[PDB]
Amino acid sequence: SGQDLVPAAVEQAVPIQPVAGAALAAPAAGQINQIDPWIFQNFVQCPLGEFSISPRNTPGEILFDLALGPGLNPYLAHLSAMYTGWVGNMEVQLVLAGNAFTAGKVVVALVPPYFPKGSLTTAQITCFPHVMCDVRTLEPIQLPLLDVRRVLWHATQDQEESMRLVCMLYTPLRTNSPGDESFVVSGRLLSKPAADFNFVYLTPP
Amino acid sequence: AVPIQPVAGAALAAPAAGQINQIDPWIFQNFVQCPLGEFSISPRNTPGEILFDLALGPGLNPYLAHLSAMYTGWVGNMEVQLVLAGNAFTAGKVVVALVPPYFPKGSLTTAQITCFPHVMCDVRTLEPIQLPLLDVRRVLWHATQDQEESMRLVCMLYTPLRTNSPGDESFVVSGRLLSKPAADFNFVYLTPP
Amino acid sequence: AVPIQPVAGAALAAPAAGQINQIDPWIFQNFVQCPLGEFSISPRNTPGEILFDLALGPGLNPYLAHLSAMYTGWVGNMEVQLVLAGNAFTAGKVVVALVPPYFPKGSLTTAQITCFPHVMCDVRTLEPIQLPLLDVRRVLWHATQDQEESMRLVCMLYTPLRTNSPGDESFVVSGRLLSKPAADFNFVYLTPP
Amino acid sequence: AVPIQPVAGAALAAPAAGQINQIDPWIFQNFVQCPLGEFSISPRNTPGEILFDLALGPGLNPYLAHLSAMYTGWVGNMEVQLVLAGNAFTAGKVVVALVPPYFPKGSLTTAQITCFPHVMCDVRTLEPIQLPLLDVRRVLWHATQDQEESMRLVCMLYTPLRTNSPGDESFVVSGRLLSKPAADFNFVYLTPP
Amino acid sequence: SGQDLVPAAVEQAVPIQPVAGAALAAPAAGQINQIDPWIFQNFVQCPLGEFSISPRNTPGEILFDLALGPGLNPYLAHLSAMYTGWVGNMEVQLVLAGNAFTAGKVVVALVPPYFPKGSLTTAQITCFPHVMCDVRTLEPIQLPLLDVRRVLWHATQDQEESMRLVCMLYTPLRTNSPGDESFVVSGRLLSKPAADFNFVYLTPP
């Protein structure tokens, strides 16, 4: 177990203040709905939480872009068939455990609602609350994805403007290996609801 | 004394916004002129003329409109004042109303403009008339890159102008509208322009 | 520990400016990327390559460049950090120098770049390298609508890269430069854009 | 820290069993190798390979399997540890899951193996990984001469191996699984073999 | 940032006792001359402070040999045009930051005045106050170069016998890399005046 990596993926400060979850949507919903408490314990992989970084990728290549919601959890995506509504923050891990020979850096940003989708150049991704992380960090980089909004809750009809989470490839991936091989790093993505996630109204699945 | 409650500014958006950004404190110290916030009454105008009508937002200010390019949202009240240039021998009255952020559009007669929370100011008043522009809304905060319906300020000719004129000109009375952000104007989220 | 005294920010402009305007406090909390503040070293580069050179001002920031459209002047220090992407088997050193706001232009050899107040950082260092960008000047404050000479940050290849590469690519080491305003960055005078 | 409650061992069988028989105390002091508890990863393996899958019982131990010939039943947890032989330059991750004693059979993708109470261990970890094998059940005690469904330990390739190899061999990483009875393993009833 | 190098380049004891600098030359000079105090702060590169070690070098190859004086500083070499005289010690750094695969050792000696110049075999370089340092040491090895003399000061006419600083290649440079490449280490040399450096008499440049 060599420690020539960068395990310096400790909790960094992201310039964002805490956000209310289910406390505001309680007096406008119609009933008391809580979800299973063992769901909040373990990090599980997103339904779209696998990607890879090849050395044939140029800086600016969006590794993943995903909106906050129940589509980031296999347990929440199954429960979101019975409800019409959700509020709360979620917590995401980032498993970039590349080989001891690679080199490179990705930057995970926190894009607000109502930002125009699409290009999102690499010069304008550091303008958001971001986390700049290497591709060798052993421990899974935890980071919060918050529910910034201007309504009381979101319907489970994906057309709502929700906060995104963009992962640009800030610098190109290179390998320093003595011969013939350039390792491809396979990144995974785990998530779990924060303490204030909750669904709103019971409807037939 | 207009019959309206105070409306919460950043106290309602704060639990949901991710940032709440302050404005330069030297901006609240100046009155700037609103676009399309100018008019003039000639003694040919019959009572009922809508002299102006303009909506609440960051587009009422040269500085706020420029700053709204970095931020995602905004909440807050504004503070408008009205100047009129008329001497001591004029006679005529103007009603300024605060139209809620719905009640879409139509012909408003004088019998109807006095049914809003309003201020009925004469035309020979010396000091600029101050009044608030309140942020009534149904959402937590507004979005800067989306013009949605907000409270409007409306001006009506209530009592027609009665003055003299030598032979020229018709002696119009000019009116201008200035504004500045109230104490609890805030933006929301730093984004790239 | 670079050998330079602290330089006064708004404490020198204040008696002469008419306003001293503050910036959003959420702006000092983020590092944004400077234009042209990126480079890469290939093992083909011989020591002496100027990797970048960029001047102090409000044009080092997407937000500051946008805000400088309302204001007349600016004073203050900046705070830059340097990120490098290299593993534990690389070898090579880079010197970052602080060039005074004169000393115009020419070829700078390595024997000369170490004669400035500088930081000599290796290439396998993990944490981003922090350093200040000081506002040395001869006037009380600078003007936003006039680019005059300010202190520059210069990057030089001091010791050449010594690494491996399988057959492709040449394993360049990438470098990026981020910045944010220091504690005493200020604008001066509210003007219309 | 796996998200499971502790499960009662002999405290649940005791009111109904006729005897509760202890095991040699020198048996809990040793880790013995489970049959079929061995595997190897080659860089040709794509993520999703079930490296092993084995059930809880007295058949995980050379001594327990021999002692179960005298006794009628058994209850208790086990204690397994996992050894992996890989150096400091490897890269790849393995998830070990605790499958409940139903949920019969099928193809388990990686998106599904992380939904169990699990441990996600890297491949360059030095010390043997310890974890429990809990006795979840619906009956008071199990019968030694009847193989019924118990909790299973499952191993999956989560992130594929990324290493080097000179020309031979393919540098597989070997993995072995050892086990020993926990504190509350018990048999039930002395019968003739 | 791997730490399989030898950062063991901490301050070693060299068998030499402290030496007077400008305190003896003060009552025989003619005036009060002090040099700028910011010069004493930063280490800058010598006018002859670059060399390289190739694996095609045999033990005994003199990497550099330089005498103590104002020729070890770009700031002092410029000031030494106005003065006729100098006394004091100086401090030298040694930037040998080779790759994690090399191997070898150099030995920096402190040769006194009046030693016959030239050959200086490798068997007779450990006979002096020496520092034996590896070629992987990260932190720049600091070491003093003192003003041992038998006069009160030295003229800035280089014919004076001053104390030298020899760098032999004690062991040959090798590389342990898996294939085809032998890295060449590029050594640098920085220096700065000690607390007792001073010039003597003002003359036209």
- Listing DSSP states for C70-119 in one string gives TBSEEE--EEEEEEEE--TT---EEEEEEE-S--------HHHHTTSSEE
Residue pair E33/E128 in contact (Cβ under 8 Å)? The answer is no
Contact between D152 and D24 (Cβ < 8 Å): no
Domain ranges of chain B: 1-193
Chains E vs B: touching, with 3+ CB pairs under 8 Å? no
Residue with tokens 């095609």: E56
Which of A4, A178, A179 lies closest to E2 in CB terms? A4
- The set of residues, in sequence order, having a beta carbon less than 8 Å from that of E136 and lying 6+ positions away, is E5, E6, E96, E97, E98, E99, E100, E102
Provide the shortest C-alpha distance from residue C65 to chain B (in Å). Answer: 11
Please spell the DSSP secondary structure of chain E, one letter per residue: ----S---------S------TTTSTTTSSS-----TTTTTS-EEEEEEEEEE-TT--TT-EEEEEESSGGG-HHHHHHTTSBS-EE--EEEEEE----TTEE-EEEEE---TTPPPS---GGGSTTSSEEEEES---S---EEE----SSS-B-SSTTS---EEEEEE-S--EE--SSS--PPEEEEEEEEE-TT-EE--B---
* Residue D11 three-state SS: helix
Distance CA E38, CA A160 (A): 62
Q: What single letter denotes the amino acid at residue A196?
A: D
Grouping H, G, I as helix, E, B as strand and the rest as coil, residue A172 is coil
Nearest-Cα distance to chain A for C17, in Å, is 30
Pairing, β C32-41 against β B93-99 = unpaired
Could you tell me which chain B residue has the CA closest to the CA of C28?
B190
* E contacts of A178 (beta carbons < 8 Å): 177-179, 181
Helix (H, G, I), strand (E, B) or coil at A28: coil
Q: Which chain A residue shows the shortest CA-CA distance from C39?
A: A171
Out of D111, D117, D125, closest to residue A74 by CB: D111
Q: Which residue has the tokens 């649940």?
A: D12
Task: Identify whether the C-beta of residue D159 lies closer than 8 Å to the C-beta of residue D35.
Answer: no
Question: Nearest-5° angle of CA C96, CA C102, CA C104?
Answer: 85
User: What is the resolution of the experimental data for this entry, in Å?
Assistant: 3.1
Closest CA to C173 of C95, C90, C110: C90
Tell me the sheet residues that pair with C54: C153
Q: DSSP class of residue B65?
A: H
What does the block give as tokens for D73? 């039943």
**CB-based burial of residue E78 (10 Å sphere; 0-12 exposed, 13-18 middle, 19+ buried)?**
exposed
Helix (H) or strand (E) holding D37: strand D32-41
A83: its two tokens: 């409800």
Answer whether A183 sits within 8 Å of D160, measured CB to CB.
Answer: no
CB E175 within 8 A of CB E51: no
Residue of A nearest to C167 (CA): A180
Closest by Cα among B48, B39, B41 to B170: B41
Top CATH class, E1-205: mainly beta
DSSP string, C19-72: --B---TTTTT--EEEEEEEEEE-TTPPTT-EEEEEE-SGGGSHHHHHHTTTBS
- Which SS3 state, helix, strand or coil, does residue D136 take? coil
Contact state of E185 with C164 under an 8 Å Cβ cutoff: no
Chain D residue at shortest CA distance from A182: D162
3-state secondary structure of C171: coil
CB under 8 Å, gap of 24 or more: what pairs does A52-56 form? A52/A184, A52/A185, A52/A186, A52/A187, A53/A104, A53/A106, A53/A135, A53/A169, A53/A173, A53/A184, A53/A185, A53/A187, A54/A173, A54/A182, A54/A184, A55/A172, A55/A173, A55/A174, A55/A175, A55/A182, A55/A184, A55/C169
CB contact under 8 A, D93 and A97: yes
What is the rounded distance in angstroms from the CA atom of residue E18 to the CA atom of residue A82? 84
User: Distance from CA of residue A183 to its chain's centroid?
Assistant: 24
Q: Does residue B33 contact residue B141 with C-beta atoms inside 8 Å?
A: no
Comparing C-alpha atoms, which of D145, A67, E49, E179 is closest to residue C164?
Answer: E179
Task: Name, in order, each residue with C-beta under 8 angstroms of A129's C-beta and a sequence gap of 6 or more.
Answer: A14, A15, A16, A109, A110, B18, C30
Rounded to a whole number of angstroms, the distance from the CA of C67 to the nearest CA of chain B is 8
Q: Residues with Cβ < 8 Å from E111, sequence gap 6 or more?
A: E120, E128, E163, E164, E165, E166
Q: What is the spatial distance between Cα A170 and Cα A133, in angstroms, rounded to a whole number? A: 9
* Contact flag D118-A41 (C-beta cutoff 8 Å): no
**Do residues A145 and A110 touch, judged by C-beta distance below 8 A?**
yes
Q: Which of A141, A144, A125 is nearest to A188 (CA)?
A: A141
DSSP sequence for B117-174: SEEEEESS--SPEEEEE----SSSSEETTS-----EEEEEEEE------SSSS---EE
Q: C–E: how many Cβ contacts below 8 A? A: 58
From residue E77, alpha-carbon distances to C93, E42, E68, E73, E155 in Å are 26, 16, 12, 6, 13
Chains near A (3 or more Cβ pairs under 8 Å): B, C, D, E
How far apart are alpha carbons C112 and C108 in whole angstroms?
A: 6
The CATH code belonging to domain C1-193 is: 2.60.120.20
Chain C nearest CA to E200, separation (Å) = 24
A130: helix, strand or coil: strand
- Which two tokens mark D31? 């880790």
Nearest CA in chain E to A179: E179
SS3 assignment, position D48: coil
Q: Which residues pair with D79 in a beta bridge?
A: D132, D180
Q: Which token pair is C160?
A: 């050449």
d(Cα A57, Cα A54) in Å, to the nearest integer? 6
Residues E33, E198: contact at Cβ < 8 Å?
A: yes
Return the structure tokens found at C148. 């005059």
Experimental method: cryo-EM
Distance from CA of D113 to the nearest CA of A (A): 9
- In this complex, whether D and B touch, counting 3 or more CB pairs under 8 angstroms, is no
Chains in contact with chain E (at least 3 beta-carbon pairs closer than 8 A): A, C
